[PDB]
Amino acid sequence: ADRGWIKXLXKDCPNVISSICAGTIITACKNCA
């Protein structure tokens, strides 16, 4: 239907899991890589 999916750049992944930000309003996840 709609094209467009994030991979895990950092500023483009508002979801993310337990690894850096762990789903939060930018706290310590100052680096995605």
Side-chain angles (χ1 to χ4, degrees), residues 12-13 28 30:
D12 251 66
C13 325
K30 230 145 266 211

Side-chain angles (χ1 to χ4, degrees), residues 5-20:
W5 223 321
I6 311 127
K7 303 168 285 260
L9 326 97
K11 276 88 179 154
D12 251 66
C13 325
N15 274 241
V16 188
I17 342 296
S18 268
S19 46
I20 314 97

Side-chain angles (χ1 to χ4, degrees), residues 1-4 8 13-14 16-17 22 24 27 32-33:
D2 225 307
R3 206 100 287 177
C13 325
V16 188
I17 342 296
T24 186
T27 57
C32 226

